[PDB]
Write a protein that binds this ligand. Structure first.
Ligand code: PTY
Ligand code: PTY
Ligand code: PTY
Ligand code: PTY
Ligand code: CLR
Ligand code: CLR
Ligand code: CLR
Ligand code: CLR
Ligand code: CLR
Ligand code: CLR
Ligand code: CLR
Ligand code: CLR
Ligand code: NAG
Ligand code: NAG
Ligand code: NAG
Ligand code: NAG
Lengths: 344, 344, 344, 344
């Protein structure tokens, strides 16, 4: 039913499932905006496919040819099925709009499924190629941040009663390499191109005259070519073509609204803001150097992933509340850190 | 069946499922009133869609055109399907009420699903954008309250046998920022606007003459335009239109009753009452300062979320019972706190 | 099937599911009588809806109009569907009993579902508004009782080899407030009113002549108004109306039997008997004062909830067996308590 | 399918599910004979309902009226559905056996479901009212038996290298109260009465002439009353009536065989034999006094429940093997108990 399709595709965790494995425990591995874009671009065409053939919206068979009254039920059924299979056969049918509109009307669900698969492909390539590496690197970075926070609080407590910036060096090294950012931009660009092509197709499909679904059909090949009792042609109409056009314009609207989001996503350096690591600069055990901005490198992408999935880090949360309290400046950062006692 | 739909949509945890993740363990992340509003506004139109096409209420096909007796079964089926697809084609049909009523009668389930999706969108945006931040902040606040309660009871026990207000400073800082409250008000306002538009549409749909479902249909395009055996027109009726109007007025009543709730929700500062933190003011380790009221800021929203999901805090419950006992004034707050022995 | 519906709605845990959350572990949060009343009042109309359209009891379509023999199958189907949709349209049909009986016959499942939803609403309001508070308070009370029992047995063992009545003070304070009892009485009263209205409706529906299901139908609007081959009217009958009346009288009987139960529930103070706390009065560490009776206050409701869900408390069970043994008076209460050794 | 129904209702744990809660861990809370009686009396009529309308045994529709050849398919369908709905309407039909046989033939599944529900009601009342109390009491009794066994074995080991009969006093007190036994006897008696009424009904239904399923039907009310082309009456037959009678006699046989079991159950004191507590009399720490027999009191019912669900007690099992070995008398009870070393 329509409501069942809605529950499956919008109100359920459709493509929102976290990786089912212990390797990525709590790691999104995909930005929220990218996940939203993929979920829409994939589950919208599927939802429209399901809707267009819902038991309520669908009168019945997808084509009716209006055989003569003399024709029996199965003769008329032969006519309808023959014309359905003959939309491909150009000789059999003669339609003013041509045969491409008939092909599109017959295979619209296939085309929507193709667009959905093509849009799901780049996210899958990301999740299967560049996701494990970033997952491992980000897990190491979070562990290093937790360890340095613990060491700093232990030092502060000892004072009240190595020291090498490994994480900073690793981030600096990531500043050079750009394979991950190149893959990310390539997959986003392919998604954008697929969306644009889908928009072109949907606009063309919705621009039809709405009468191209009606085509003339001739069961006059073979032994029936010279038969007399059979009329030379029939009036066939492809039902649900109006529904297809409505859903196609809906998908076109959604995709044109979505494309600016993908374009904004492509410009990762601009998105790289609100320095996540700036909060850690007040730790004595952490060097006061952010050095993450203004670069078409994997460093900006790692900064984005950190700003996305750093809320799960207790040390980061503690430092963030310390920073927020520092806005008033009533107290002292080391005193607040010592009082917090948030090692684990 | 009707009962199955009821069990799924009203008697089950439809959209009442808690976040399936360890990040939010026991945190609602959504006020009870907001959750009720979203659940109604989403699962009502879906329930009505399912009901309108229930196997019992539905006689059968959604349109019947009453072809002549001479017409065969599949000729009549062609007529019915053609008219169903031609509700869009204005030339084919001539109805007194126009063609918009026919469009609405055909696509009412789609319109209800659209309203449900549009009403579910703002809650989803909230849960995916502003929910993680408030979850982390509120978890930190609850942990700080538990820790300060433990410290105060330990101090009392030591007396019987830092001290910095970090949580108060954090709340004071939240008094300034307003991004969360702005997002909350924006999503509530969008929900209200969607509800009002849905009410307008449902009122228009229910105001129809009830005879607009009957339209005249002409299969007279193409080779059949000059055919003689076919009548110039047919009498088609869209079944289930009365059911659609009944369910639409039901939804209109529900939404007009719900809109005052959304308006009351918009005025969060008025809702900010019954100070949750007032109970903690009797703790020696906690400063006697509430400072949370009369502000279009995130502080009021945090106060609401605390008053919502603070019952899970054992320290808060203990302080609440101490406060309630203090109404009589027979005993002493520190003595009762020491006797409680409710560290964990 | 009928047996499947029975298993789902009477032999299964339909609305008998305990709260699926760790917050309420073993707490009913709903009295047994109230749960029975809600389960009946909700799952009876749903069961009757399912039964009335069971594949065995149902001959087929819900209306047959007996078109002339000259009419084709789909002409007759048009007639039947038109009349089904025209029960609303007063002009189309002319029935002796009127049009309200036809409306009721068509929408009886909807009306039963409406009554079920309206009866499920007050229980849901209770469980979502006043259940968390009573759950927290009752959990605290049980924990306090366990702690005082442990302290008393420890003192007895020490003798053989604070002391403040916090729980008693909390109960005394609850004696004043009445918001929970007011909400309980309001929800019970609304349930009673809904049940009475349902009884009125079912009595009216069952009082019909049983021939109102037969109505005269006229497909004579539009181009067919002046058509000659079509008869001026048809004889239509709404099938399953007898089944609807039978199930409606069954529901009426059940609801009239249930209403006295709801009225008895409304009088909570009378139900407040068999003092649960009287057993704890023999503990040296517990003050000898019950002070819970004769009040339209939340104290009586808390006493009811205690008498309901106190069997899970080991200390209460031990004190109950001590009390029962004290009926003979052969031994001594402190000696029996010491011998029991039931700390945990 | 038939085999699926059999698997669900006889070969599966239909109504044999243990209470899904930690409160009753391993406690039957229902005697084996009572559970068997309830399972049969409930799942037999449901199984017969399912069988009577199985896709294999069922030819098709439940009534056929044999309309004239001139009648079209949907005219004949109208006739059949009209007569199906008119079995209630006495004026419409004229049958030699009357109208009650037709009512019974139409609503036999409803009557079987009613009997099943009425037979399931007393067991449900027991499980929801008197089951928690007996569960708690019996758990306490088992814990006391385990503790006294442990104390006795510890004393024996100490000798080789309070003392109050709390459980005996509790059982003696149970000797007085009789509310549980009264509820048990009342529910068993109601089950017996329901079974007898079901037997009466099934005997009456099976005693029919087998031709009462054939009734004369007249679609001659309304505009068709004076119509000429329609015959004055039709020959309608209610299919599956023979299957209903066969299954009804099967159920009658099962219930008459079952009723003696219920009568034997009612006489609980006679069932109270094979003293379970007699084995514990050899323990030095346990007083040598059974005092459980010859009483219409809850003590006999508790003895039955003990004899039912005491096999789970390791101490009871050990004492039972000691008793069995004592039949030969080769050894000594205290020596065997010491050698067993079965504390836990
Ligand atoms: C993806 C979207 C693809 C849509 C665009 C396809 C490009 C078609 C270009 C060739 C057109 C062509 O050969 O001319 C028409 C015949 O088309 C044809 O006979 C070819 C029809 C094109 C294939 C359409 C079917 C798509 C199936 C997708 C399946 C995906 C499933 C994946 C799981 C003639 O007619 P006319 O009207 O152009 O001219 C008639 C008067 N000059
Ligand atoms: C959402 C609710 C939308 C309802 C309001 C739509 C505004 C329509 C305004 C344009 C009307 C128009 O062009 O005029 C009518 C034709 O309408 C048309 O042909 C356009 C019909 C409007 C589209 C209705 C279909 C909604 C589909 C929703 C799908 C959602 C799915 C999402 C998953 C002519 O006829 P007349 O009677 O106005 O005048 C006839 C005598 N002057
Ligand atoms: C809930 C139970 C509601 C039943 C009582 C409704 C009160 C009806 C009062 C108005 C009656 C009225 O206008 O008069 C009749 C027309 O009724 C009408 O045309 C209005 C019919 C009333 C609506 C019945 C449909 C209930 C749908 C429930 C849907 C719930 C779904 C929720 C998920 C005329 O005929 P006459 O025989 O009275 O007089 C004919 C000779 N003077
Ligand atoms: C439960 C088993 C109930 C069976 C016994 C019912 C007692 C009927 C007594 C009244 C009989 C009566 O009024 O006389 C007959 C009409 O019966 C009637 O018109 C009344 C028919 C009785 C209702 C049968 C339908 C049972 C529905 C059970 C639904 C349960 C569902 C629960 C979920 C006339 O005809 P005649 O042959 O007696 O005399 C005809 C020549 N003098
Ligand atoms: C997904 C991508 C590939 C879709 C590409 C656009 C498709 C949908 C449409 C839009 C415009 C279309 C073209 C419009 C006009 C003509 C001229 C005609 O004589 C042959 C077909 C041809 C050449 C069409 C082929 C298909 C076409 C290119
Ligand atoms: C992503 C955005 C830009 C998509 C917007 C949809 C645009 C591309 C659509 C809307 C209407 C469409 C046109 C409608 C009709 C025709 C005439 C046909 O003989 C060739 C294709 C052509 C010229 C279409 C090309 C694509 C088109 C211009
Ligand atoms: C969800 C929102 C967009 C719904 C907006 C209201 C819709 C349902 C209805 C209510 C009143 C309607 C209008 C009423 C009157 C007219 C004048 C007519 O000559 C053209 C259509 C037009 C202009 C209608 C368009 C659709 C309309 C605006
Ligand atoms: C949220 C609340 C205010 C909704 C209440 C429903 C209101 C808006 C509904 C109920 C009846 C409706 C009117 C019914 C009939 C017409 C005539 C038509 O030619 C234009 C629209 C118009 C004028 C409708 C406008 C909207 C309307 C006034
Ligand atoms: C659930 C509640 C609202 C149901 C209320 C009772 C319903 C079922 C029935 C019972 C008696 C009925 C009334 C009986 C008589 C008349 C007089 C007639 O000229 C108009 C309808 C009217 C006024 C009926 C309206 C509907 C009615 C009130
Ligand atoms: C909860 C208890 C009291 C419900 C008992 C059912 C009662 C209320 C039912 C049973 C028969 C019913 C009556 C049957 C017939 C008519 C005639 C009609 O023109 C007006 C309503 C009226 C007068 C009904 C009113 C309600 C009624 C009296
Ligand atoms: C479950 C219980 C209520 C069933 C009771 C027995 C039912 C099945 C049957 C068995 C015998 C039957 C009775 C036999 C004879 C007559 C005399 C006739 O002129 C009216 C019906 C009446 C009075 C019957 C009513 C229904 C009846 C009582
Ligand atoms: C539990 C045991 C005793 C049930 C045995 C079934 C008995 C009660 C059945 C079997 C045959 C039945 C009888 C068959 C026929 C008739 C004639 C009818 O006009 C009145 C009922 C009457 C007289 C039935 C009464 C009940 C009956 C005697
Ligand atoms: C049909 O008859 C025509 C007559 O002109 C002939 O040319 C043609 O070959 C025939 N077709 C078949 C399939 O026999
Ligand atoms: C139908 O016949 C008419 C006669 O006036 C002619 O004008 C029209 O073109 C014909 N239509 C078709 C589709 O051949
Ligand atoms: C039907 O014919 C009658 C003849 O009196 C006329 O008044 C009426 O307008 C016609 N109806 C239609 C819909 O053409
Ligand atoms: C049918 O015709 C008879 C002729 O005697 C008449 O008495 C009766 O009222 C008519 N019935 C209807 C429903 O018009």
């Amino acid at each position: 039913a329509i409501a069942q399709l809605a529950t499956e595709y919008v109100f359920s965790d459709f493509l929102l499932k976290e990786p089912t494995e212990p390797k990525f425990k709590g790691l999104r591995l995909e930005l929220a905006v990218d996940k939203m874009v993929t979920c829409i671009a994939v589950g919208l065409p599927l939802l429209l496919i399901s809707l267009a053939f819902a038991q309520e919206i669908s009168i019945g068979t997808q084509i009716s040819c209006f055989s003569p009254s003399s024709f029996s039920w199965r003769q008329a059924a032969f006519v309808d099925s023959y014309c359905w299979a003959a939309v491909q056969q150009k000789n059999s049918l003669q339609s003013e709009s041509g045969n491409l509109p008939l092909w599109l009307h017959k295979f619209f669900p296939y085309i929507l499924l193709l667009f959905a698969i093509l849009l799901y492909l780049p996210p899958l390539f990301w999740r299967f190629a560049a996701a494990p590496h970033i997952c491992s690197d980000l897990k190491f970075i979070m562990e290093e941040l937790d360890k340095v926070y613990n060491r700093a609080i232990k030092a502060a407590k000892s004072a009240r009663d190595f020291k090498y910036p490994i994480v900073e060096q690793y981030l600096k090294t990531k500043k050079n390499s750009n394979n991950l950012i190149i893959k990310y931009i390539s997959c986003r660009l392919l998604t954008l191109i697929i969306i644009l092509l889908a928009c072109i197709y949907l606009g063309y499909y919705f621009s039809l005259s709405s009468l191209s679904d009606e085509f003339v059909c001739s069961i006059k090949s073979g032994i029936l070519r010279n038969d007399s009792t059979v009329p030379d042609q029939f009036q066939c109409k492809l039902i649900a073509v109006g529904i297809f056009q409505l859903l196609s314009v809906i998908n076109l609207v959604v995709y044109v609204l979505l494309a600016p989001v993908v374009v904004y996503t492509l410009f990762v350096p601009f998105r790289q803001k609100t320095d996540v690591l700036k909060v850690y600069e007040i730790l004595p055990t952490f060097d006061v150097l952010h050095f993450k901005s203004e670069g078409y490198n994997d460093l900006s992408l790692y900064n984005l992933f950190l700003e996305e999935n750093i809320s799960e880090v207790k040390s980061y949360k503690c430092l963030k509340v310390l920073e927020n309290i520092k806005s008033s400046g009533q107290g002292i950062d080391p005193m607040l850190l010592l009082t917090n006692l948030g090692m684990i």
